[PDB]
Design a protein around this nucleic acid. Structure first.
Lengths: 106, 197, 136, 191, 172, 97
RNA sequence: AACUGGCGAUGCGGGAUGAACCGAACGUAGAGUUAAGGUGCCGGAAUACACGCUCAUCAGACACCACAAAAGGUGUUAGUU
RNA sequence: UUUGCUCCACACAAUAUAGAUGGAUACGAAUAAGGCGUCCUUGUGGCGUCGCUGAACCAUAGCAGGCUAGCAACGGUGCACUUGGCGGAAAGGCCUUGGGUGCUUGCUGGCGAAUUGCAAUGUCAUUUUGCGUGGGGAUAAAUCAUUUGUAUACGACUUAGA
């Protein structure tokens, strides 16, 4: 009743360069402080909401949101990526974002 | 928890500081650095100034100023290290660059905050013991970064001052610690004690 | 006549030190030092821990200062025999820091409604702190 | 090859009181006081009972011993200063040109007239390193008496005072004059 | 490079009708696999005789396991090796409880301190060391010492994240 | 190909630019010393180029050439009014200057 | 001059850079997987872990690939007789 | 040079976010350390104490927080006045008097909710401008064109002019 957050935060890193060339649909996604890769199998599939507030309105609001989920890990500490209806403008690097708890196995 | 991170820079590493500190601002990270005169390197005092003279001769021929440039502020001397440890020239990389502050000493706007340090970049730690190092503003003022003694006095004044603030503090908080040390044996403390305390 | 020395002395070593096995399968069990191997490794055995007559990197085990006596070069019956002389784990139990690990453990042992009771016990406990400190 | 416990084991007499602030010693002798920054050695300093103090290095090294022995030497040098104190006597040499020597005063700076320095109209003047305390050695030509509490109080003074008369310009492996040394001694002689 | 066993490669270089079963000679190889234990077995066999790898036959193999490993020992090591300049023999002394540990430490020492690479090094012998008088090496004598008990100066830790709120102490 | 010789060349390099330089009135880059053991003292004074002439006077440097002699001297002479004191500014003394 | 292999005539992944070098050759695509090649920063990916050497008033940081000797040195380290 | 310009209260529009959404929560010194109690001559003295985690602490119910009663107590809170002191490095902030006000989910009442219908954020920061109300203040300075020469290819410098 004082701390009205109910999701998981996270920070967009980039899209994956294999070494050199970005994969500008397949991201690099910063998790909210997990280096233990073992937790993830429940989390794989949880959604992602990116609020951005443009002054232009859509059919309902000026708060328009691009979404994702958790798929599987990467690297030596278990780093996951997302799924885009609309890919990011190759600009969102270090933007905060929502990650959810549904579709819950529980 | 700190959107802007207040950091003292007393006796630390340099390239091993600034390569992962160079990794830091990429996240949108905003950090203020104080006491930018307090830094050491594994390596002696002698050779290094001379190495700055070795760099110092590099400039473009038909206008001998317009080449590389040469400065005496130890923060920007630190950015000489840091510049090749970043991608400092994009909307992306520059947008990361613009999120950082470094201060020789602690200004009275910044006296009111606490100070933290990094063990990985701490100079005494990554240290095969038996190595020499260098006092930063000493060497800087020895080449001519002359303004050292002003804030050398000022930080004396305010470390004195927050030490007095601390005499108020530690002298006070013991009376707090007595003032609810007397709260011994509440059954709620038995309960929450059995709940994790 | 002073020659007063202040510091530069902390937890000692011995053969027969029950040590805190700071990592590994024990990761916090306790074992007497049976023998020194070298500067890097010593032969140990925690039979109280059940952990065998074995070695560990000295940079991969941490000390206790909690010494006890040990006839060096002895098998596990003599080792746990000396543990029977040394029922001693009561005393790093008497170290609050292990009990602090029990505290953060028991912190990690709350229900949300129990935790709601923790909130309201801050409200009523700390309400009684504010009547221990309302005017007082 | 990393000898497993290295140390210096120094007997303490009873006219002296020190206090080692965790490496930093507060030396007091029957002559006076000394200290030293000893936060460049990383030992545990070791009172036993006002009659010996060790240093302590868990597993000291080879060149660590090559300085760590004479750690004790230089400590005992400090003992002889803080209790007893050195007192050398030096020399002067000319052959033809009678060098006037004087502790002329510049405001307590205690320079030294060196006159007729082999015909030189130029005059030398040597200030006194203070702490080491100097009288003219009376009754003996070409001598003087220094008296300090470090072996470089008096032998660094005698070293660069020796370096006063570095004489050039002639075949000086034949031409031999100058400030030399005679003697090394003690402030309390017989101590 | 990896861990090794205490093998037992027994060979009988091929029987004839004149000589059925030549006499079953073993070697006690210290190898990871029986395979290259046998390849090196043969590699010492042509050193022995006018043989080659098809010219004979290997009886058997036993990784010689240990029914009582719990007795910590000392060790004596003779070495045939080839350096970059001087191919020689050595003797050094290693305290262990198994011989393979002295192999690993041996090649950390020789690969590290004399840059010695294994494919021209042939260890002669380990007569293990038993008594106090059986020791040349002063560093082994440093563990022939008695009751070294001591504090630890300059203890370090690891940061939780990357920080402390504090410049900490190196107390143990 | 080194040229032919070595020789002193022209100019001096602590003076540049040789553009139309700073202003009508010139800058000042160092000052006489304040001593707060002393009373109220000042640093300099300003004048006007009034004229120059040749003026007779002595010379008596011993050992020199015209000891116990006189010369004439091409002098230069300034204009000097008295000037009116009106202002004071404090200067906060910063770690930048 | 006698053998194999590429460019020529052929692109892609490693060598900052590279006709002939390391992997691997070519339909449009997509889901899983790697070579070559690597994981302080740029830099993707471990300031991962283990044992040692070294401190360089001229370390060092490599197939391709882009470099010193004779002679030395109570420098160090360890052994051998 | 619209009673213009420019300050105080508005409301309404416009108005963008390199990236809000419990809390950035202040000595110094030392590292082969001291810290903080504790006591005493106050010393480089006496006892503790402490690591090895901030996992710290604060803060935590209600229409993102609802109305509405009664209990112990006599808080604690804001608000906006009022009192005092301090801050230059960038002080521009810090601390202090008094008044009132709200609450108390610390103890017992009454409520109150739906239908967004099974997901669809289902929308709570300043960003600036305009305007209009109704509270203020102020009553310019430059150029060109003339003139000086020390100033100059020209630009450009420097004088004068009721």
């Amino acid at each position: 009743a004082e701390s009205h957050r109910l999701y998981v935060k996270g920070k967009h890193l980039s899209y994956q360069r294999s070494k050199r060339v970005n994969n500008p649909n397949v991201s690099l996604i910063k998790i909210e402080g997990v280096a233990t890769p073992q937790d993830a199998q429940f989390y794989l599939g949880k959604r992602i909401a990116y609020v951005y507030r443009a002054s232009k309105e859509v059919r309902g609001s000026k708060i328009r949101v691009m979404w994702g989920k958790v798929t599987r890990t990467h690297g030596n500490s278990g780093v996951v990526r997302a799924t885009f209806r609309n890919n990011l403008p190759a600009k969102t690097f270090g933007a905060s974002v929502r990650i959810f708890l549904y579709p819950s196995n529980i | 928890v700190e959107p802007v991170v207040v950091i003292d820079g007393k006796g630390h590493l340099v390239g091993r500081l600034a390569s992962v500190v160079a990794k830091q601002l990429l996240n949108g990270q905003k950090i203020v650095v104080v006491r930018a005169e307090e830094l050491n390197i594994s390596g002696e005092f002698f050779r290094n100034k001379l190495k700055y003279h070795d760099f110092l001769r590099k400039a473009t021929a038909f206008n001998k100023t317009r080449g590389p440039f040469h400065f005496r502020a130890p923060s920007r001397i630190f950015y000489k290290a840091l510049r090749g440890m970043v991608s400092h020239k994009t909307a992306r990389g520059k947008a990361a660059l613009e999120r950082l502050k470094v201060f020789e000493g602690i200004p009275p706007p910044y006296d009111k905050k606490k100070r933290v340090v990094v063990p990985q970049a701490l100079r005494v730690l990554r240290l095969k013991p038996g190595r020499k190092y260098t006092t930063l503003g000493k060497l800087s003022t020895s080449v001519g970064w002359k303004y050292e003694d002003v804030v050398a006095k000022l930080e004396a004044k305010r470390k004195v001052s927050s030490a007095e603030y601390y005499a108020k503090k530690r002298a006070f908080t013991k009376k707090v610690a007595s003032a609810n040390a007397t709260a011994a044996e509440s059954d709620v403390a038995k309960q929450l004690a059995a709940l994790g305390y | 006549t002073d020659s007063i020395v202040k510091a530069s002395n902390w937890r000692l070593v011995e053969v027969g030190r029950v040590v805190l096995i700071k990592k590994g399968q024990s990761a916090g069990k306790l074992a007497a030092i049976v023998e020194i191997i070298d500067q890097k490794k010593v032969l140990i055995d925690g039979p109280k821990a059940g952990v065998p007559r074995q070695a560990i990197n000295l940079g991969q085990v941490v000390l206790t200062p909690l010494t006890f006596a040990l006839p060096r070069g002895a098998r596990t019956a003599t080792v746990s025999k000396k543990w029977a002389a040394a029922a001693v784990c009561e005393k790093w139990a008497a170290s609050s820091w292990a009990k602090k690990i029990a505290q953060r453990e028991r912190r990690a042992a709350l229900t949300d409604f129990e935790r709601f009771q923790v909130m309201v016990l801050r409200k009523q406990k700390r309400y009684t702190v504010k009547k221990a400190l309302a005017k007082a | 090859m990393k000898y497993i416990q290295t140390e210096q084991q120094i007997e303490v007499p009873e006219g002296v009181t020190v206090s080692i602030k965790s490496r930093i010693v507060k030396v007091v002798g029957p002559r006076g006081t000394l200290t030293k920054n000893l936060k460049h050695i990383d030992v545990t300093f070791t009172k036993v009972n006002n009659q010996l103090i060790k240093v302590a290095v868990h597993n000291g090294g080879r060149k660590h011993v090559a300085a760590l022995r004479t750690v004790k030497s230089l400590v005992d040098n400090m003992i002889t200063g803080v209790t007893k104190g050195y007192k050398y006597k030096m020399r002067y040499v000319y052959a033809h040109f009678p060098i006037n020597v004087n502790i002329v005063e510049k405001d307590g700076a205690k320079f030294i007239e060196v006159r007729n320095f082999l015909g030189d109209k130029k005059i030398r003047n040597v200030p006194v390193r203070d702490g080491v305390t100097i009288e003219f050695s009376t009754n003996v030509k070409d001598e003087i008496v220094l008296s300090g509490n470090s072996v470089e109080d008096v032998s660094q003074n005698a070293a660069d005072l020796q370096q006063i008369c570095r004489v050039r310009n002639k075949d000086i492996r034949k031409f031999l004059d100058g400030i030399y040394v005679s003697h090394k001694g003690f402030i309390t002689e017989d101590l | 490079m990896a861990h090794f066993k205490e093998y037992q490669v027994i060979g009988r270089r091929l029987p004839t009708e004149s000589v059925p079963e030549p006499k079953l000679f073993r070697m006690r190889i210290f190898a990871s696999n029986e395979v290259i234990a046998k390849s090196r077995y043969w590699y010492f066999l042509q050193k022995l005789h006018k043989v080659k790898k098809a010219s004979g036959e290997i009886v058997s193999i036993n990784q010689i396991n240990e029914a009582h490993p719990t007795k910590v020992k000392n060790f004596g090591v003779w070495v045939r090796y080839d350096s970059r300049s001087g191919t020689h023999n050595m003797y050094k002394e290693i305290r262990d409880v198994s011989r393979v540990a002295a192999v690993e430490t041996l090649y950390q020492d020789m690969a590290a301190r004399h840059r010695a690479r294994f494919r021209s090094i042939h260890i002669l012998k380990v007569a293990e060391i038993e008594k106090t008088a059986d020791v040349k090496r002063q560093y082994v004598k440093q563990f022939l010492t008695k009751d070294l008990k001591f504090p630890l100066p300059h203890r370090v830790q690891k940061s939780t994240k990357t920080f402390s709120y504090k410049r900490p102490s190196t107390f143990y | 190909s080194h040229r032919k010789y070595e020789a002193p060349r022209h100019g001096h390099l602590g003076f540049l630019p040789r553009k139309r330089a700073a202003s009508i009135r010139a800058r000042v880059k160092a000052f006489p010393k304040d001593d707060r053991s002393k009373p109220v003292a000042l640093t300099s004074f300003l004048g006007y180029k009034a004229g120059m002439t040749t003026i007779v006077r002595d010379l008596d440097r011993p050992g020199s050439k015209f000891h116990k002699r006189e010369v004439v001297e091409a002098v230069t002479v300034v204009d000097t009014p008295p000037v009116v004191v009106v202002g004071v500014v404090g200067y906060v003394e910063t770690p930048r200057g």
